[PDB]
RNA sequence: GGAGCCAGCGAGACCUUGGCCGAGAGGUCUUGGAAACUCCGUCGUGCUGGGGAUAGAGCAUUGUAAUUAUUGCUCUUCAACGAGGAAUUCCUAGUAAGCGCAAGUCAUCAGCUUGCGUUGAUUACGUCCCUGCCCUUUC
């Protein structure tokens, strides 16, 4: 039967692998999308 | 009887242990003499306080 | 036509309209006696200002105070600033001003509150 | 480039944050609302104790602060949240799920409040550039270069991940410690004003029935 | 002058002098102990301890509070009685009734000396414990809170009712007799102070 | 001059509610023994003798400061809370207290529904006004 | 001047004008035997089977100034000291007259 | 002084309509998870 | 019975006892109103079955 | 108490499990509690009821153990009460009346009488008539 | 790194649903 | 449906226990008239709605 | 048990003001589209006139075609509960806390969410001593 909507994400172990390389991943090449003074 | 002593001056930066705070009192028998001590209550100048004890003075209770 | 005036009196939700008018010296609220006002423990509360003033001021006027909103403290409060607030608008309108003049000091004298709504406002003592 | 009610102060003054409930709020949204203050380096925890909504916005501007946050909760599970910038909006109403608290973990210890470096990651749409403005600004500008704090808001089908970590640069890589909390946050709201005023127009709406909102992506 | 609210009697004579309850005086209540006046305050004349004033706004303001109201306030305790001031008041004055009965004395008097009689001189602090003194207001604090826990834990589940336990609790606090629960405590913990001191 | 708002509350419902014991023209069903006047209640009145009578004279009153009056307003006017539901008053006492006055002609069947203060019922009501003051 | 009757296990005041009770003393358990005003009146005492003897303030039922326990036996007769206020004099099918403080 | 003797199961652990909630429960809750 | 309720039931005399006794087990006669006066176990199964059938799709 | 179901942890029936556990055996034995509350709960004393019984288990649980209490005199059934005390932290009679064995909240002295005497049992300390102990002793106080 | 992942310092039992869906992934 | 406020409703009939409720949350619904739903929660009295 | 009484939020046939019945629940005939609290009374330290679970007998509502459930009212029956261990969470003025009322307005919520008003406090409002988080030393 159909859905209405979106169901809600399930953070799984794999989930948390992939999301915590990026995190890790990037701070390698110090790309931080961070506010500076202007 | 225990002797009476009125606030005159509330001490700061005295280092005194939390809830507990350092000030000058003046006799009121004898205006002249003042004596430092450690109230654990609230306390301003111009309020007055017992003094069980009028012999010892007041040392920093850390 | 009759002179009247008409004053407000608030506190919290509660809200007084007073109606004063020349008269005999007849004070109602609500359709009932200042006697009558409840509870009986404030009933000197409403009496504040006639007592203050004297009695005689009042004798020559009608006074007709209808109350709706708040709680029953905050209704002799706007009850007693209603009538208040009414006597001065009277004495101001329809009498010498020396007598509005008296009339508001002596009575700031006592309570500031009585013409002044009392606004108990939120205060963020956390800073912030 | 920066929207226009962040253009004016943005990398100039730093962000005033203030953090609130709903009334008579459950124990554990007091916690999860101070989560949420020690999330923001700029923001305090205020009681909302019969305030009144007019009231807390004109009194919160009287202060000069710059954003609100609103909490709600179902018995003491945080539901939504909602930011307001001041001093006429924009106004973003956010869904909580799966929420996971700090007081929930054993023996955690502190949080760090150094200013934390921020990742921004699958945000592609206009949409997804305004929602990053406006969780951009609620921090403080020049994060140092050595700072070992980090907040990531990654975008997965427009159920934004939040997670807070801690770094330690080895010899041969990276080692994130995560801090907490954990939960996912949904736009369905965006005003054009404050909180307070429910006839704002509307910049942007979710619409949860249309047949495609099994797999429409808007960030 | 005519008017239509006519004024008893009774009203004239209050206006001639503010007494508690219109039946108590102030005039002559006086605190024994030089000190606590100035915390323990008898000289500004109320009708009725409710007064709708803001003492928690200063740290002090509640020292200039009127005694009776202080008590009034410690008495409305338990969560189930938290807000419930007029109730307070009602148990007050009837305390006042029976401690006219019992001691021909003034009841108010009778509350300024077991207030004075209970508060304690001394105490200890945790380092095991340090003798310290005691600030006056923190003796009129301690004073009233134990005299209305033991009032109430008298008869909490006695035949007794709050107004007779508050009222034997005064008479032996002013007394002097160690039947009250909270001369017992100041007891003890001048007695342990002296220990550590 | 006298009138029902000029005395308190209290004062006059007991002297009224005397008034209508002591006339005795006041019909009164037999079931006020049994009932307790409301489902919220947990006990019948205790003053078995003399609460309906007090009754109608509560109710002799809220018919002159309000002119219409109607059962249904009289059941929630001595309505109480029971979550609560707040029950209103037993409807049948109520109707029949309003017959009972209207015998004696102390109300009568209003225009437009409800009932009316009598001409001669609010000058009666008016004198039980007076003598509590004398 | 209102006057006392001691009946059954209740104390009735009643309006000498009136006639009628006015006042109605039924906390007492078991029979009482006594309701002795002091001089002033604004105290009566009274005595029960039981042989507890109490004090209450007239015209206000309510409140129990004094409750003290004579005896084990009935005290049949309690009274007032006419000079003294603060003595109140008891006495008990015990034989003993015990006079009591208040 | 009396004496009245304790009340107690000789082997405690930590009607039927009543089970049948909890077995509710227990096989309620599960659904949800797999419609999830 | 006309008996006043504020009494202990130590002192009542005797004619009020034995009224009391005719009013309760005569209760009609003086007017009192009238209105004064496994299938489980199947659907227990029937639940246990669907969670049988519940762990068999898994 | 340890889920095996939960028994009063004993010296000599679970060895093993106390050796998991940690704790040394030796100092396992419920035995000599229970040999103590039956011959203190039947001395002439407790049914003159002028006795009252304090337990404060090692753990550092304070139990109330009502006078009224009649416990069983097999140790099997005894150890059965320890463990459900400690579960529903009270005890309820057959006739439901009073509840004979409850837990309390520490320190033990809030609970002991205002004016009391406090001694240990100590093998090294001097030896003294109990009797004269008591006699020369307050009437006021408690022991 | 799998030591301190405190959500899979150790959490409060019933944090993670991991075990539900694995097993849910199984069926 | 046997109530509505407004876009919430309670409907009745569609599942005899609370446990089919369950199933079917969030499925998609839809009127005569046309108008689109969504399966909220099960209520727990009565049985089905 | 009587008697006295005060709110502010809120508008998508079905709702209703009013009359007549019934102890109540609830029926029938018509018109338009608040509590907490105050005063006076009864009980009285007794698991008691606190508690209302379970159970029996009735009087009604809602469907539907079953003697099926459903939701109320009346009488009787009258349980656990006697202030809560080890531990633990939060809190500074209209604040803690008590009290009721209203709307369910695309996320969440169905005796739960939000909002509204009413009663209204004790203590603290100083300290870096302990703990923790920071700033400075163009030392
Ligand atoms: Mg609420
Ligand atoms: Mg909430
Ligand atoms: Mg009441
Ligand atoms: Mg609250
Ligand atoms: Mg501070």
């Known amino acids: ?38 | 009887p225990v002797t009476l002593a009125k606030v005159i001056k509330v001490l700061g930066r005295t280092g005194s242990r939390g809830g507990v705070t350092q000030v000058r009192v003046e006799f009121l028998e004898d205006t002249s003499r003042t004596i430092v001590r450690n109230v654990k209550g609230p306390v301003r100048e111009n309020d007055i306080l017992v003094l069980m004890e009028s012999e010892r003075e007041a040392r920093r209770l850390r | ?128 | ?219 | 002058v005519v008017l239509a609210t006519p004024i008893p009697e009774e009203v004239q004579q209050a206006q001639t002098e503010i007494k508690l309850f219109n039946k108590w005086s102030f005039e002559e209540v006086e605190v024994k102990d030089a000190s606590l006046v100035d915390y323990v305050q008898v000289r500004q004349p109320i009708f009725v301890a409710h007064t709708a004033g803001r003492y928690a706004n200063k740290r002090f303001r509640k020292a200039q509070c009127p005694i009776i109201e202080r008590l009034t306030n410690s008495l409305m305790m338990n969560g189930r009685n938290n807000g419930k001031k007029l109730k307070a008041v009602r148990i007050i004055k009837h305390t006042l009734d029976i401690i006219n009965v019992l001691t021909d004395q003034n009841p108010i008097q009778v509350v300024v000396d077991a207030i004075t009689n209970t508060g304690p001189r001394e105490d200890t602090t945790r380092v095991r414990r340090q003798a310290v003194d005691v600030s006056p207001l923190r003796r009129v604090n301690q004073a009233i809170a134990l005299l209305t826990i033991g009032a109430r834990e008298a008869a909490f589940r006695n035949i007794k009712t709050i107004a007779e336990t508050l009222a034997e609790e005064l008479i032996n606090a002013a007394k002097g007799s160690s039947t009250s629960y909270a001369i017992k405590k100041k007891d003890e913990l001048e007695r342990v102070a002296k220990s550590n001191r | ?134 | ?102 | 002084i009396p004496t009245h003797a304790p009340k107690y199961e000789e082997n405690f652990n930590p009607k039927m309509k009543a089970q049948l909630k909890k077995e509710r429960k227990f096989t309620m809750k599960e659904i949800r998870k797999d419609a999830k | ?58 | ?143 | 790194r799998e030591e301190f992942n405190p959500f899979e310092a150790v959490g409060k039992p019933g944090i993670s649903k991991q075990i539900g869906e694995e097993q849910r992934k199984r069926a | ?49």
């Open chain 9, 1 to 58: 019975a006309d008996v006043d309720l504020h009494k202990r039931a130590g002192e009542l005399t005797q004619e009020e006892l034995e009224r009391i006794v005719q009013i309760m087990q005569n209760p009609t006669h003086y007017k009192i109103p009238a209105w004064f006066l496994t299938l489980a176990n199947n659907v227990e199964s029937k639940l246990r079955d669907d969670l049988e059938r519940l762990k068999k799709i898994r």
């Open chain 4, 1 to 219: 480039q920066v929207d226009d009610e962040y253009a004016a102060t943005s990398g100039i003054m730093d962000p005033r944050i203030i953090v609130t409930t709903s009334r008579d709020p459950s124990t554990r949204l007091s916690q999860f609302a101070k989560e949420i203050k020690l999330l923001f380096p700029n923001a305090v925890r205020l009681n909302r104790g019969n305030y009144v909504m007019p009231n807390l916005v004109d009194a919160c501007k009287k202060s000069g602060t710059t954003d609100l946050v609103v909490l709600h909760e179902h018995r003491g599970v945080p539901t939504s949240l909602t930011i307001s910038h001041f001093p006429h909006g924009p106004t973003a109403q956010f869904s909580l799920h799966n929420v996971v608290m700090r007081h929930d973990i054993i023996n955690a210890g502190n949080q760090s409040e150094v200013n934390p470096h921020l990742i921004f990651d699958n945000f592609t749409t206009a949409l997804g550039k305004r929602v990053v403005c406006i969780l951009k600004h609620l921090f403080n500008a020049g994060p140092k270069k050595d700072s070992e704090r980090v907040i990531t808001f990654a975008n997965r089908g427009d159920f934004i991940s939040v997670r807070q970590h801690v770094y330690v640069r080895t010899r041969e890589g990276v080692e994130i410690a995560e801090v907490g909390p954990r939960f996912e946050m949904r736009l369905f709201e965006l005003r054009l004003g404050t909180l307070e005023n429910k006839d704002a127009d509307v910049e942007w709406q979710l619409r949860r029935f249309i047949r495609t909102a099994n797999k429409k992506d808007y960030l």
């Open chain 6, 1 to 134: 001059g006298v009138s029902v708002r000029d005395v308190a509350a209290q004062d006059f419902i007991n002297a009224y509610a005397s008034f209508l014991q002591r006339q005795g023209k006041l019909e009164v069903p037999g079931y006020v023994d049994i009932v307790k006047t409301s489902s919220g209640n947990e006990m019948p009145p205790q003053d078995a003798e003399g609460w309906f009578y007090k009754r109608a004279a509560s109710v002799a009153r809220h018919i002159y400061m309000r002119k219409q009056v109607g059962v249904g307003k009289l059941n929630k006017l001595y309505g109480g809370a029971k979550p609560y539901k707040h029950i209103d008053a037993s409807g049948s006492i109520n109707r029949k207290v309003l017959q009972a006055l209207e015998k004696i002609g102390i109300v009568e069947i209003s225009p437009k529904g409800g009932r009316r203060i009598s001409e001669n019922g609010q000058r009666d009501l008016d004198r039980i006004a007076a003598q509590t003051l004398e």
């Open chain 3, 1 to 128: 036509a009759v002179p009247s005036v008409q004053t407000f009196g608030k506190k919290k939700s509660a809200t007084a309209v007073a109606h004063v008018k020349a008269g005999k010296g007849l004070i109602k609220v609500n359709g009932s006696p200042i006697t009558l006002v409840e509870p009986e423990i404030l009933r000197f509360k409403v009496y504040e200002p006639l007592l203050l003033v004297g009695l005689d001021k009042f004798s020559n006027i009608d006074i007709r105070v209808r109350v709706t909103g708040g709680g029953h403290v905050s209704q002799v409060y706007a009850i007693r600033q209603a009538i208040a607030k009414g006597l001065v608008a009277y004495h101001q309108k329809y009498v010498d001003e020396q007598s509005k003049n008296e009339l508001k000091k002596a009575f700031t004298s006592y309570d500031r509150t009585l013409l002044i709504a009392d606004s108990r406002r939120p205060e963020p003592k956390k800073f912030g």
């Open chain 10, 1 to 143: 108490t340890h889920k095996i179901k939960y028994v009063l942890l004993n010296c000599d029936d679970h060895q093993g499990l106390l050796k998991k556990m940690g704790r040394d055996i030796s100092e396992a034995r419920p035995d000599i509690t229970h040999q103590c509350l039956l011959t203190l709960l039947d001395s002439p004393i407790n049914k003159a009821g002028k006795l009252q019984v304090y337990i404060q288990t090692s753990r550092g649980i304070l139990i109330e153990v009502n006078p009224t209490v009649r416990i069983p005199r097999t140790f099997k059934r005894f150890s059965g009460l320890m463990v459900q005390l400690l579960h529903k932290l009270s005890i309820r009679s057959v006739n439901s009346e009073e509840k004979l064995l409850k837990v309390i909240k520490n320190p033990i002295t809030d609970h002991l009488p205002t004016k009391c005497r406090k001694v240990t049992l100590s093998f090294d300390a001097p030896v003294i008539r109990v009797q004269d102990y008591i006699e020369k002793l307050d009437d006021d106080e408690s022991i």
């Open chain 1, 1 to 38: 039967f159909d859905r209405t909507a979106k169901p809600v994400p399930v953070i799984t172990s794999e989930v948390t692998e992939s999301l915590e390389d990026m995190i890790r991943r990037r701070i390698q090449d110090s790309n931080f999308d961070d506010l500076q003074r202007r």
């Open chain 7, 1 to 102: 001047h209102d006057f006392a009757v001691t009946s059954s296990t209740r104390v009735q005041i009643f309006s000498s004008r009136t006639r009628q009770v006015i006042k109605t003393f039924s906390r007492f358990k078991d029979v009482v035997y006594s309701a002795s005003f002091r001089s002033d009146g604004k105290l009566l005492c009274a005595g029960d089977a039981t042989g507890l003897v109490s004090v209450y303030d007239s015209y206000n039922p309510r409140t129990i100034l004094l409750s003290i326990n004579a005896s084990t036996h009935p005290t049949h007769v309690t009274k007032f000291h006419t000079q003294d206020n603060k003595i109140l004099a008891t006495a008990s099918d015990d034989r003993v007259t015990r006079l009591w403080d208040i």
């Open chain 12, 1 to 49: 449906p046997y109530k509505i406020f407004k876009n919430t409703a309670f409907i009745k009939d569609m599942f005899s226990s609370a446990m089919e409720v369950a199933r079917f949350e969030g499925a998609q619904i839809k009127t005569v008239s046309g108008i689109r739903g969504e399966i909220k929660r099960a209520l727990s009295k009565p049985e089905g709605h």
